[PDB]
């Protein structure tokens, strides 16, 4: 079988699962990294396509391709359209976390087909018997996204978080950031206290954060304001088969309710 990789995880699945029994897709990262940059050990390089997000995202690896040729990747993220960045560097640049609307985990789901077939249709069928399935569920968890997160009004919706990664989730529907994306570190008071502030203008009420690992920033603004500093959120990467966020879609699913779960 055809083997392929992936840049991180957060598509690792999303990927295999729509390639299923069929071929063998691995990231090059495990549960728990940062996907935006670091870990890049010799380990790699041979599968036959690599597929990636793109957007500056995972662009760790855009001069890691000079070690090699062909192997034609893909990305994937080109549907299309960015909400762009706010602050800090990047500054204006596109936001890359895009699959965290999934009306746009569409869009891959259907643009990752597309690199399947044109490498071996010997079973170009499969795909787009898989892809099709995926694509429904993709579908069908929109509607369980937007119909819970729809009960929270008035505006009490914004969802709190360190990577400010959600910028489409909050696109798609009804926020708040201590860093706009990764680099560098956490913005010394001046940042922090701007999340504090707004904590307390609004004024609440609990906040989140992805994984880890800057504890230390969204710490301290639960204990400085009135918070209770909720469960992590998933993005970046997927967790564990006993933590919860095993695969995608249960990703989605999860972090919708613990985001409501956060309003009184």
Known sequence: KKKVLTTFTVLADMVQNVAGDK??????TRIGAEI???????????????????????????????????????????GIEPIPIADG?????????????????????????????????????????????????????????????????????????????????????????????????????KQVQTVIEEVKTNNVPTIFCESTVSDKGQKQVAQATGARFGGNLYVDSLSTEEGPVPTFLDLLEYDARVITNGLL
């Open 23 to 28: 071929l063998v897709v691995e990231s090059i």
């Open 36 to 78: 935006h940059g670091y870990e890049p050990t010799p380990s790699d390089q041979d599968a036959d396509l690599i597929l990636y997000n793109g957007m500056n995202l995972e662009a760790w690896f855009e001069q890691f391709l000079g070690n090699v040729k062909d192997v034609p990747s893909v990305v994937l993220t080109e």
């Open 89 to 189: 560097p990047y500054t204006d640049k596109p936001n890359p976390h895009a699959w965290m609307s999934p009306r746009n985990a569409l869009v891959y789901v259907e643009n990752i087909r597309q690199a399947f077939v044109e490498l071996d249709p010997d079973n170009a069928k499969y795909y787009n018997a898989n892809a099709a399935v995926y694509s429904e569920q993709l579908k069908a968890i929109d509607r369980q996204l937007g119909a819970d997160l729809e009960q929270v009004p008035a505006n009490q919706r914004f969802l709190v978080s360190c990577e400010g990664a959600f910028s489409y989730l909050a696109r798609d529907y009804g926020e708040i950031y201590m860093w706009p994306i990764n680099a560098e570190q956490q913005f010394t008071p």
